[PDB]
Amino acid sequence: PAVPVIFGDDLEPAVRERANLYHRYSVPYHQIELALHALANDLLSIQY
Amino acid sequence: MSRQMWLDTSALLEAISEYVVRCNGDTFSGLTTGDFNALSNMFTQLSVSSAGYVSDPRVPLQTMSNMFVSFITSTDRCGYMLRKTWFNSDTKPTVSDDFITTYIRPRLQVPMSDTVRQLNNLSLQPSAKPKLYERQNAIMKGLDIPYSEPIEPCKLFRSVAGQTGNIPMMGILATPPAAQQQPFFVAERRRILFGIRSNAAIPAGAYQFVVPAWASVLSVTGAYVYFTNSFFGTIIAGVTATATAADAATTFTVPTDANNLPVQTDSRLSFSLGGGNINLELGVAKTGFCVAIEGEFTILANRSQAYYTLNSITQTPTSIDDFDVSDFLTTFLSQLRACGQYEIFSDAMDQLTNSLITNYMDPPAIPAGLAFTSPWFRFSERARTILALQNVDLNIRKLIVRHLWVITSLIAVFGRYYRPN
Amino acid sequence: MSRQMWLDTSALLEAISEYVVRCNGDTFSGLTTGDFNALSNMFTQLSDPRVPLQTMSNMFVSFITSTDRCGYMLRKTWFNSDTKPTVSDDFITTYIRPRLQVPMSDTVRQLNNLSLQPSAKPKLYERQNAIMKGLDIPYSEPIEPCKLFRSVAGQTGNIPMMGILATPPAAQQQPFFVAERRRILFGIRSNAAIPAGAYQFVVPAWASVLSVTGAYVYFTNSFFGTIIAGVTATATAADAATTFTVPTDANNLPVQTDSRLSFSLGGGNINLELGVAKTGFCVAIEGEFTILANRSQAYYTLNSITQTPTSIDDFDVSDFLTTFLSQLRACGQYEIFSDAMDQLTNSLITNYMDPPAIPAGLAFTSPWFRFSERARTILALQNVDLNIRKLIVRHLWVITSLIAVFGRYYRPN
Amino acid sequence: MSRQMWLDTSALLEAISEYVVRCNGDTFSGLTTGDFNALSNMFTQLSVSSAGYVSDPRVPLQTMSNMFVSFITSTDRCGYMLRKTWFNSDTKPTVSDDFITTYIRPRLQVPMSDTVRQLNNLSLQPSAKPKLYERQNAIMKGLDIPYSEPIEPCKLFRSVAGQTGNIPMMGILATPPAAQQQPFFVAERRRILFGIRSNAAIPAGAYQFVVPAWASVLSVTGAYVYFTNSFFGTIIAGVTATATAADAATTFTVPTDANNLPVQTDSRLSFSLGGGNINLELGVAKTGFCVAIEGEFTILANRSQAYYTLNSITQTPTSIDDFDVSDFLTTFLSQLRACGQYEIFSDAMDQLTNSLITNYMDPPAIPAGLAFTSPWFRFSERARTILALQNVDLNIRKLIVRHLWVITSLIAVFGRYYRPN
Amino acid sequence: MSRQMWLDTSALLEAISEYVVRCNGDTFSGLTTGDFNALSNMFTQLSVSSAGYVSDPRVPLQTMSNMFVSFITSTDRCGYMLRKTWFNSDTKPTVSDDFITTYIRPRLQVPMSDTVRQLNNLSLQPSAKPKLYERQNAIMKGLDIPYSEPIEPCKLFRSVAGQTGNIPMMGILATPPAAQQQPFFVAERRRILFGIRSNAAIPAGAYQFVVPAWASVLSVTGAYVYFTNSFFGTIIAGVTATATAADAATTFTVPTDANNLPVQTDSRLSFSLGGGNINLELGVAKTGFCVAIEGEFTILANRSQAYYTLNSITQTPTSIDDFDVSDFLTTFLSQLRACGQYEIFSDAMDQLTNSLITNYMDPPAIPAGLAFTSPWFRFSERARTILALQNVDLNIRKLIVRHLWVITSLIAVFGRYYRPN
Amino acid sequence: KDIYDKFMCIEHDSAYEPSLTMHRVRVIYSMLNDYCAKMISEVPYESS
Amino acid sequence: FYIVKNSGFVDRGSTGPVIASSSVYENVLKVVHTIADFDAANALRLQRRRVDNTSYTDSLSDMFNGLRSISSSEFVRSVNGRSVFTEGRIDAIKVNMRAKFDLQFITEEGGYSKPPNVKKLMFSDFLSFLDSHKSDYRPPLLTVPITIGLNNLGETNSNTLRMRSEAIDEYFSSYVGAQILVPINVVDTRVYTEFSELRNFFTGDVVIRDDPFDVWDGVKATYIPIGVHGVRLDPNGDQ
């Protein structure tokens, strides 16, 4: 539905991360369980 | 973000409430009822995720409302959603505020949801008293409302060329007549009223009644049409409720049915005030008469727009209801008073209302003559006043009203759990 | 056992009902609805499923019938505290026990008071709690003002005040506050015109807890479908505005306007100001009535009662007994019960007054299922301290409801 | 910067004062007092420059007042604090000024500070004479005041439809009556007064009294209620205080209590005037009566907002107190006169209070008829004036009074150690 | 447990309150105040059975109150406290009840704590409005109150043969007189006054006033003694306030001071009403006179036991104050209303009060004719009632009152943080 | 049964050992690395 | 945690999921003594007194004896196949100490051949605890075991008479005997009967880029000066 990683940078459309580069999977895990790993996206952001 | 995003979330909150009421006193020890499971899962989606386990649902809900009030009260933050474009587009705004990144975001399923919606309008027994959601969709996107959903006609009432009030007409219908007067068309909670009152008699024959703009979208089933002399309990003067066992059958006819509709009969009628004028054939002369249509009133399929788009509005000033927001604010108000903010809030709202009004008229300045005679939570009135501004183009006032409503509704939903202390 | 222990089960039976009505006609062949599944598990948590429900009602009637069995529930102490009692009756042993989940269950209950659209017509449970433990009722739940009515200084009753409103006035009388199912009425009837200015109205006790949203406030002359004399609902497009104010709101609340109003009678007084003199005027407030936050106690505690005797509704019990009664008449056991209950009621009144004796002047005008009345009767004994009367009402109520809930499936064979 | 940043620092300076009071004459040779320890540390927190033990706390405290006066005078600098938004939102302003940088910043420990604060409202014996910080919070953020803090009724007073003022109503209460007049409700420092004056005896029976908007906030404990004929020491005529051991009991009841409260009795009572009305029952007819409630007065829970928000105001013009600012200015004034600036200050203030009001009315200009009858420090009066402008609507007026007040107080606190030389 | 154990803990809760107040707005980050540490240390000691360190008090404080309310609500639990023994001895009882074991336990340091208490009665400026602790000790163990502690004489008033009431006498003092009536000794908040009223002049001579039992324990410092005509702002008839610069000085004498005490002089006097009678020498004849003593009143050394033990009470019925509990209840009451329990709580106290009274009279049964006019928290009035039972011997009635008081006090202390939700 | 032990330490009561909370703060940071930095990248799927 | 003479819970014939347990439910306990904190419990353990000629006891033990003992048998009591509990409530001592409860599940197949081995904690063990920690300067943690018997009679199906009812009860007695316990209410479980909802509980999102980001590490971006060039010295702010 939308990009999971939020890079605040201003980029050329050509290289800008977009929705269709990602897919969302529904897995047999409670959100609580996946929670921590979701932070990676936040870390991946301010670092690279 | 998107006006859409706010709705999807509002809907979720309204869903949470629904399932709370569903679970009240149904939370037993040895079982996980489906309703509770759903309630549990909804709580789970409300927070971020990084909000961890939910041990006491009161907290995340409480936290969310608190952040909402400190947001909805600061122009600097919630400004973005006050500009014209927020109401008329699905443009993801470039605004950074951790309230929105946390709570507001697309929640509904597509396209399955939209579809279930459409199917409902064709459903047999819709919710008698619907969620703000539906109203929100109508007032903002101008979507359709269920075909069988009932409504109290008197709300629909708007000012027309002739009579400029539904309630005011009361004090006059109770004053004896000087001579044969003009017809009148009024509405109660559960019935529609029309007729002619005179101090002299009125001959038997055909009389035409021009169904008012606002009422030309009403439909009724299981209705009883009879002659009566009361309007909201107040007695109507200058009319007769008399009849002989063998009087000449009095009937009327609407442009949608080729057969005559009887009056004063134990037969349950079904007809619609759409299409034209009611042609009434009075069987036996009467000294002023009043017909009553009492039954289940619904808005004619696919014409609810007139009401919610605020299109049924012809003249200025005008009478206008609140689409029921008051009925939903109750709780949030109680919560406000209960912690002493009812005042500090009431101030911040005038501020919000004023800034909204502003972004609608070029050039950017509060129009002169604007002075409210009521507080933010008495919408019905404030709407009247917004609509009464001679300065601004009518269609813009209409928008402002609609806009204010959506924001107001949003409050009624999100603030309910406010507790700062 | 515990009072909580009963309420807990009551709730579980009202739940059995709710889900039964949910599953009606929604029980298909290759399909197991979530509702039916719940209902099923509730049936299990209790004990074909009709046989058991029956056995249970039977043993209940059998229990609440003999004063020797349920004696403990009639003591001033059972209603006063959550102290587990010492009793061995194979009914309580088999059916009464905790069934709600703590603390969760409670947490939900409160989250509910803040809910947007609570139930329009709540379960007995919610009432039981308010009346017994003095809990809160949802802030947005609606009630019919006339039920909220209790006798006050100025007037004896509400309904009776009708026949007096139908009689032409002799001279400018005293203010009146009366209530219908869907609206509140207040004004001053007179046979001589009344100047225009400012008029202080003091909101009665019972009515000071009400709050209205989506209301039309207009001048009328009817009350419960009856003509009010000495009042004129006349006016003209020229007449000056007739506003009114309440302490809770800083602005003026207009009358005879198509505008929807929402104000609160918690300020204690309505300040009304007529713009044009009238030969008797009656203002009406018609809208949605809810009970203000934290003040729903007054109503369900009977603490809103000041005079004696007084007017009193039945907290809607009558409406729930219907099922049970109809099942009694089909057994002939209607009379037997009618009597056994007459004892159950005596004994309870007994245990509330020291020394232990059926007080002076206790003749019941109506049978056990006309609570609204028998309540009036008990609230009428001046030889017994006031507060103790109130309690007997509240207490008697709870047992009544419990009956309304557990007997339903009664089929004594 | 942030309005919050100013309050926080005020509270610090206001705390430094407190401890200076504590340490006076308790500074001995070999002792180490928790008080002096606190003080000397606080002396440090002022100056961003340095952190060495202050050998002479006079120096930095002075430098600070001086810097402040020099800031608060120049509208080019302290202008930002006079904007509509500064009194509203907690949005750190983009302003660069030597003062703000060196002395203003957040100082209260969070969240602890708030926790303590709320825990306090429930405390048994709150300060009988509160720091300014408390009012600053109630007047600006609308926070709660301690549930059992005392207050003098008359301050609480405001103008009502019935009677215009309180103090002035005295002279009228003196003049014998023409004939049975309308009820009066006045308030002294330590007691509330109500009753009905008449030259002719008025019957024994029930009498209803509508408690005013300003007094429906009150609640008393440890009270003696009796019949008197004095108001602020002045004699009230048209009332009798006569009675005899035979007279029937004279009880009064309040909606909040289902029991009769006795009058002219040695028992100490406690009741709430928030019920909306008093019901008095004269046991024996009296030629004019006046009841007095003398006890400990407190503002009901979650209601102090009415007083501190100026929401108790319904008329215009109106009688308004000053929230006691006058009592705190004393020091600053006496320090101004000391160096001959009392004059030059009044002129910079008038520019401040003016320039302030300006920003409050769109479009941006001084109102017509702004006749300041008193100087900047007689606030009570200047408030009446602001609140009497028919041009600007009530709300904006009130907002200006509040905003003005906060600035006023802010001065009363920071100026004190001012010595130019 | 021990009556002592409750007092001890109460003292601690009160200390906690005190320090919460001391810390309010004095909690700056980067600075650990000695006060804040003490506040913190006390919290720890509160939840000593479950912790050795505390982060935020918001919770344990709440929990404690909630549990406490749940305690004095159920007779079954707190029954042991309503027995005659609990008020008499320090026998460590054994009660299996979570609340008692968890919160009620020894807090004060012995004997050092007592030593300080004594050293205090001797202090120069004791607290003007003391804690409940002091009162609790006085009323229960009958200990001494500080020698310099000021008090309002009117509270001290009790009924004596001559004049039955204090406030009631206001009515008679206002009615012009017939003959030369008996002398009156009445009292106000800040001044005590006596005299003789007549319609005909009184022979300038020597008059003797017997000092009433209740006032025979008073002492004044910094007092002006003048002639006056008012009493609580109510005019007294049969009294001359007139005097001439030529008049012969009027003086009075007390069995303590061998010297004459001037009247209508600007000299601040110091004397004691203990010892017997006041000898007044009227220098000039006057048509009714009223001497007034206005200054600071304190109870004499070692005589407080009279006031606080109810030994001032000589006859029945009698009017008595409430030792100010009502001024403390305020908070706990405001918290009960906040969650609609104010109703149930009352019904519970009633049960408590009754259950308590019962345990005092043999055989175990509510006395005949026991009718309460007031609710549990209007103590003053309820004590009057207990004290008015002719079938129960005096000493027991007093105890009922003293005992009931302590419990009421305790409630006012322990309940403050109640919030169930 | 093993719910993040390095951070819980059921054996010790945080109410008698303020030291623990300090230790926890320490752990938290190391958890950024052990959990938060490990990004779920492979959810297995098949065509059906 | 509670101290009690004897306890257990057998609910034979039930169709519920719980049919046996080493512990009981909270409402079945009657608290007659309350030990405030570790300290106090420890203090009582140390107040020894002479009982008779050759024996001594201790305030804690002395208090434990004051409790009514309910026959093991009475716990497994049954009437026509349904377990019933005619006895009152279990007299018990409430100890307000922090404690960890070790949960354990056991599945009852229906074949009553080999009795399960349920871990039970005796009063004796609690004393043994208090003595190994008498000197500790901060309360120790008691690990209290609690077993729950899950109803799994589904794998057992025939109508043939194999044994005597008395035997079945005797079987279940294996669950009773515990002296130190924590209420079954303590155990927080979610119980699903329709697979559907078990799934709806266990469902979550993970959005993942199809192709992994290509992260460049050793990029070397350094400034390089251009050749010789005309240098202009910016002039100082003049007047």
mmCIF file with all atom_site columns, C-alpha atoms in Angstrom, chain D residues 11-12 15 18-19 22 41-42 45 107-109 112-113 115-116 119-120 122-125 127 131 147-148 190-191 221-222 224 226-230 235 241-243 256-257 259-262 264-270 294 301, chain E residues 14 17 20-21 24-29 31 33 35-36 55 57-58 61 129-131 154-155 157 165-168 170-171 175 189 232-235 319 321-322 324 326-327 330-331 334-335 342 373 375 377-378 380-381 412 416-417:
data_model
loop_
_atom_site.group_PDB
_atom_site.id
_atom_site.type_symbol
_atom_site.label_atom_id
_atom_site.label_alt_id
_atom_site.label_comp_id
_atom_site.label_asym_id
_atom_site.label_entity_id
_atom_site.label_seq_id
_atom_site.pdbx_PDB_ins_code
_atom_site.Cartn_x
_atom_site.Cartn_y
_atom_site.Cartn_z
_atom_site.occupancy
_atom_site.B_iso_or_equiv
_atom_site.pdbx_formal_charge
_atom_site.auth_seq_id
_atom_site.auth_comp_id
_atom_site.auth_asym_id
_atom_site.auth_atom_id
_atom_site.pdbx_PDB_model_num
ATOM 1   C CA . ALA D 1 11  ? 8.985   29.535 39.028 1.00 0.00 ? 11  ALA D CA 1
ATOM 2   C CA . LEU D 1 12  ? 12.729  29.312 39.557 1.00 0.00 ? 12  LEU D CA 1
ATOM 3   C CA . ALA D 1 15  ? 11.569  29.597 44.214 1.00 0.00 ? 15  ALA D CA 1
ATOM 4   C CA . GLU D 1 18  ? 11.098  31.306 48.817 1.00 0.00 ? 18  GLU D CA 1
ATOM 5   C CA . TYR D 1 19  ? 14.488  29.874 49.890 1.00 0.00 ? 19  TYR D CA 1
ATOM 6   C CA . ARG D 1 22  ? 13.907  30.415 54.461 1.00 0.00 ? 22  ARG D CA 1
ATOM 7   C CA . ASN D 1 41  ? 22.538  25.725 43.987 1.00 0.00 ? 41  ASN D CA 1
ATOM 8   C CA . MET D 1 42  ? 19.644  27.670 42.583 1.00 0.00 ? 42  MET D CA 1
ATOM 9   C CA . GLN D 1 45  ? 21.176  27.813 37.681 1.00 0.00 ? 45  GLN D CA 1
ATOM 10  C CA . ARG D 1 107 ? 13.977  24.209 34.129 1.00 0.00 ? 107 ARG D CA 1
ATOM 11  C CA . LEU D 1 108 ? 11.323  22.042 35.730 1.00 0.00 ? 108 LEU D CA 1
ATOM 12  C CA . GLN D 1 109 ? 12.066  18.337 35.911 1.00 0.00 ? 109 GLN D CA 1
ATOM 13  C CA . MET D 1 112 ? 7.930   14.554 38.041 1.00 0.00 ? 112 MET D CA 1
ATOM 14  C CA . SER D 1 113 ? 7.008   18.237 38.367 1.00 0.00 ? 113 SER D CA 1
ATOM 15  C CA . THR D 1 115 ? 3.028   14.557 39.141 1.00 0.00 ? 115 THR D CA 1
ATOM 16  C CA . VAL D 1 116 ? 3.924   16.431 42.304 1.00 0.00 ? 116 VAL D CA 1
ATOM 17  C CA . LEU D 1 119 ? -0.677  15.116 43.932 1.00 0.00 ? 119 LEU D CA 1
ATOM 18  C CA . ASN D 1 120 ? -0.694  18.511 45.538 1.00 0.00 ? 120 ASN D CA 1
ATOM 19  C CA . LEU D 1 122 ? -5.205  16.695 46.960 1.00 0.00 ? 122 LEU D CA 1
ATOM 20  C CA . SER D 1 123 ? -2.848  17.762 49.775 1.00 0.00 ? 123 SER D CA 1
ATOM 21  C CA . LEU D 1 124 ? -4.388  18.558 53.182 1.00 0.00 ? 124 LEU D CA 1
ATOM 22  C CA . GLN D 1 125 ? -2.968  21.982 53.824 1.00 0.00 ? 125 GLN D CA 1
ATOM 23  C CA . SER D 1 127 ? -0.239  27.141 50.758 1.00 0.00 ? 127 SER D CA 1
ATOM 24  C CA . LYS D 1 131 ? 3.075   31.614 44.495 1.00 0.00 ? 131 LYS D CA 1
ATOM 25  C CA . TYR D 1 147 ? -8.946  21.529 46.154 1.00 0.00 ? 147 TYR D CA 1
ATOM 26  C CA . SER D 1 148 ? -8.653  22.985 49.651 1.00 0.00 ? 148 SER D CA 1
ATOM 27  C CA . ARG D 1 190 ? -14.466 36.190 55.170 1.00 0.00 ? 190 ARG D CA 1
ATOM 28  C CA . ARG D 1 191 ? -18.179 35.767 54.495 1.00 0.00 ? 191 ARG D CA 1
ATOM 29  C CA . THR D 1 221 ? -16.540 24.290 55.733 1.00 0.00 ? 221 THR D CA 1
ATOM 30  C CA . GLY D 1 222 ? -16.384 25.253 59.387 1.00 0.00 ? 222 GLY D CA 1
ATOM 31  C CA . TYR D 1 224 ? -21.522 29.596 61.257 1.00 0.00 ? 224 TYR D CA 1
ATOM 32  C CA . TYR D 1 226 ? -26.707 33.578 61.111 1.00 0.00 ? 226 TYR D CA 1
ATOM 33  C CA . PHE D 1 227 ? -28.852 36.719 60.766 1.00 0.00 ? 227 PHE D CA 1
ATOM 34  C CA . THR D 1 228 ? -26.862 39.930 60.675 1.00 0.00 ? 228 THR D CA 1
ATOM 35  C CA . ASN D 1 229 ? -27.185 43.537 59.508 1.00 0.00 ? 229 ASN D CA 1
ATOM 36  C CA . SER D 1 230 ? -23.685 44.529 58.501 1.00 0.00 ? 230 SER D CA 1
ATOM 37  C CA . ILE D 1 235 ? -25.037 49.025 58.600 1.00 0.00 ? 235 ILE D CA 1
ATOM 38  C CA . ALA D 1 241 ? -31.770 40.639 63.577 1.00 0.00 ? 241 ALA D CA 1
ATOM 39  C CA . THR D 1 242 ? -34.320 40.255 66.362 1.00 0.00 ? 242 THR D CA 1
ATOM 40  C CA . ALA D 1 243 ? -35.438 36.875 67.721 1.00 0.00 ? 243 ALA D CA 1
ATOM 41  C CA . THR D 1 256 ? -26.094 18.881 47.152 1.00 0.00 ? 256 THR D CA 1
ATOM 42  C CA . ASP D 1 257 ? -27.285 17.893 50.638 1.00 0.00 ? 257 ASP D CA 1
ATOM 43  C CA . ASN D 1 259 ? -30.559 17.477 54.970 1.00 0.00 ? 259 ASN D CA 1
ATOM 44  C CA . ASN D 1 260 ? -31.725 20.680 56.565 1.00 0.00 ? 260 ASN D CA 1
ATOM 45  C CA . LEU D 1 261 ? -29.000 23.153 57.508 1.00 0.00 ? 261 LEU D CA 1
ATOM 46  C CA . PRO D 1 262 ? -29.779 25.199 60.660 1.00 0.00 ? 262 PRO D CA 1
ATOM 47  C CA . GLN D 1 264 ? -28.552 31.064 64.021 1.00 0.00 ? 264 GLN D CA 1
ATOM 48  C CA . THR D 1 265 ? -27.068 27.959 65.685 1.00 0.00 ? 265 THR D CA 1
ATOM 49  C CA . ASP D 1 266 ? -23.699 27.182 67.316 1.00 0.00 ? 266 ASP D CA 1
ATOM 50  C CA . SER D 1 267 ? -23.038 24.198 65.070 1.00 0.00 ? 267 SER D CA 1
ATOM 51  C CA . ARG D 1 268 ? -20.301 24.432 62.387 1.00 0.00 ? 268 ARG D CA 1
ATOM 52  C CA . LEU D 1 269 ? -21.407 23.509 58.913 1.00 0.00 ? 269 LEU D CA 1
ATOM 53  C CA . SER D 1 270 ? -20.085 22.589 55.517 1.00 0.00 ? 270 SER D CA 1
ATOM 54  C CA . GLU D 1 294 ? -19.081 32.902 57.734 1.00 0.00 ? 294 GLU D CA 1
ATOM 55  C CA . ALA D 1 301 ? -13.052 21.008 42.323 1.00 0.00 ? 301 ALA D CA 1
ATOM 56  C CA . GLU E 1 14  ? 0.295   13.988 56.675 1.00 0.00 ? 14  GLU E CA 1
ATOM 57  C CA . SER E 1 17  ? 1.166   15.782 52.220 1.00 0.00 ? 17  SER E CA 1
ATOM 58  C CA . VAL E 1 20  ? 4.273   17.367 48.524 1.00 0.00 ? 20  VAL E CA 1
ATOM 59  C CA . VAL E 1 21  ? 3.307   20.986 49.200 1.00 0.00 ? 21  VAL E CA 1
ATOM 60  C CA . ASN E 1 24  ? 5.382   21.943 44.500 1.00 0.00 ? 24  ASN E CA 1
ATOM 61  C CA . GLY E 1 25  ? 7.093   24.056 41.837 1.00 0.00 ? 25  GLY E CA 1
ATOM 62  C CA . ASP E 1 26  ? 10.465  23.587 43.502 1.00 0.00 ? 26  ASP E CA 1
ATOM 63  C CA . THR E 1 27  ? 11.351  20.528 41.499 1.00 0.00 ? 27  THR E CA 1
ATOM 64  C CA . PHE E 1 28  ? 14.014  21.745 39.114 1.00 0.00 ? 28  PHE E CA 1
ATOM 65  C CA . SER E 1 29  ? 16.017  19.405 36.921 1.00 0.00 ? 29  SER E CA 1
ATOM 66  C CA . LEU E 1 31  ? 18.855  19.772 41.400 1.00 0.00 ? 31  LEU E CA 1
ATOM 67  C CA . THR E 1 33  ? 16.383  19.354 46.895 1.00 0.00 ? 33  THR E CA 1
ATOM 68  C CA . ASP E 1 35  ? 12.923  18.521 50.601 1.00 0.00 ? 35  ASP E CA 1
ATOM 69  C CA . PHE E 1 36  ? 12.422  16.284 47.573 1.00 0.00 ? 36  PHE E CA 1
ATOM 70  C CA . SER E 1 55  ? 10.101  5.897  41.265 1.00 0.00 ? 55  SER E CA 1
ATOM 71  C CA . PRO E 1 57  ? 4.161   8.067  43.885 1.00 0.00 ? 57  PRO E CA 1
ATOM 72  C CA . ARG E 1 58  ? 1.160   8.474  41.635 1.00 0.00 ? 58  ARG E CA 1
ATOM 73  C CA . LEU E 1 61  ? -0.578  6.528  46.940 1.00 0.00 ? 61  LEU E CA 1
ATOM 74  C CA . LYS E 1 129 ? -3.036  26.042 61.721 1.00 0.00 ? 129 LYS E CA 1
ATOM 75  C CA . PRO E 1 130 ? -1.641  22.751 63.082 1.00 0.00 ? 130 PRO E CA 1
ATOM 76  C CA . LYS E 1 131 ? -1.848  19.274 61.597 1.00 0.00 ? 131 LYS E CA 1
ATOM 77  C CA . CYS E 1 154 ? -15.853 30.749 69.851 1.00 0.00 ? 154 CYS E CA 1
ATOM 78  C CA . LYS E 1 155 ? -14.823 27.157 69.058 1.00 0.00 ? 155 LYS E CA 1
ATOM 79  C CA . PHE E 1 157 ? -17.573 27.596 73.627 1.00 0.00 ? 157 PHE E CA 1
ATOM 80  C CA . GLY E 1 165 ? -25.786 29.192 73.302 1.00 0.00 ? 165 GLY E CA 1
ATOM 81  C CA . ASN E 1 166 ? -23.194 31.534 71.794 1.00 0.00 ? 166 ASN E CA 1
ATOM 82  C CA . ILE E 1 167 ? -24.465 32.341 68.336 1.00 0.00 ? 167 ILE E CA 1
ATOM 83  C CA . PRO E 1 168 ? -28.119 32.038 69.448 1.00 0.00 ? 168 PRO E CA 1
ATOM 84  C CA . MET E 1 170 ? -26.981 37.142 68.912 1.00 0.00 ? 170 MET E CA 1
ATOM 85  C CA . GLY E 1 171 ? -30.718 37.359 68.423 1.00 0.00 ? 171 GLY E CA 1
ATOM 86  C CA . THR E 1 175 ? -33.609 43.154 70.802 1.00 0.00 ? 175 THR E CA 1
ATOM 87  C CA . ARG E 1 189 ? -13.539 34.497 66.037 1.00 0.00 ? 189 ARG E CA 1
ATOM 88  C CA . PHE E 1 232 ? -20.348 39.345 64.554 1.00 0.00 ? 232 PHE E CA 1
ATOM 89  C CA . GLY E 1 233 ? -21.336 42.519 62.745 1.00 0.00 ? 233 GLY E CA 1
ATOM 90  C CA . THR E 1 234 ? -24.760 42.496 64.372 1.00 0.00 ? 234 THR E CA 1
ATOM 91  C CA . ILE E 1 235 ? -25.803 45.535 66.434 1.00 0.00 ? 235 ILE E CA 1
ATOM 92  C CA . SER E 1 319 ? -23.570 23.138 71.470 1.00 0.00 ? 319 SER E CA 1
ATOM 93  C CA . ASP E 1 321 ? -17.676 22.590 67.520 1.00 0.00 ? 321 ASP E CA 1
ATOM 94  C CA . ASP E 1 322 ? -15.967 19.824 65.541 1.00 0.00 ? 322 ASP E CA 1
ATOM 95  C CA . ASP E 1 324 ? -12.080 21.542 62.517 1.00 0.00 ? 324 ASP E CA 1
ATOM 96  C CA . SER E 1 326 ? -14.758 19.584 58.379 1.00 0.00 ? 326 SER E CA 1
ATOM 97  C CA . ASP E 1 327 ? -11.883 21.740 57.050 1.00 0.00 ? 327 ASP E CA 1
ATOM 98  C CA . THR E 1 330 ? -13.035 18.851 51.840 1.00 0.00 ? 330 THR E CA 1
ATOM 99  C CA . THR E 1 331 ? -10.564 16.975 49.692 1.00 0.00 ? 331 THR E CA 1
ATOM 100 C CA . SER E 1 334 ? -14.411 16.303 46.454 1.00 0.00 ? 334 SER E CA 1
ATOM 101 C CA . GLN E 1 335 ? -12.846 13.031 45.427 1.00 0.00 ? 335 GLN E CA 1
ATOM 102 C CA . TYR E 1 342 ? -20.526 10.048 47.765 1.00 0.00 ? 342 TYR E CA 1
ATOM 103 C CA . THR E 1 373 ? -30.154 15.234 61.453 1.00 0.00 ? 373 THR E CA 1
ATOM 104 C CA . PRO E 1 375 ? -24.554 13.352 57.362 1.00 0.00 ? 375 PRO E CA 1
ATOM 105 C CA . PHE E 1 377 ? -19.200 14.689 57.618 1.00 0.00 ? 377 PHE E CA 1
ATOM 106 C CA . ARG E 1 378 ? -21.115 17.429 59.380 1.00 0.00 ? 378 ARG E CA 1
ATOM 107 C CA . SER E 1 380 ? -20.374 19.227 64.646 1.00 0.00 ? 380 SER E CA 1
ATOM 108 C CA . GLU E 1 381 ? -24.090 18.556 64.320 1.00 0.00 ? 381 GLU E CA 1
ATOM 109 C CA . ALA E 1 412 ? -10.070 12.664 56.015 1.00 0.00 ? 412 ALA E CA 1
ATOM 110 C CA . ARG E 1 416 ? -7.695  11.723 49.686 1.00 0.00 ? 416 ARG E CA 1
ATOM 111 C CA . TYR E 1 417 ? -6.142  9.751  46.823 1.00 0.00 ? 417 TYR E CA 1
#
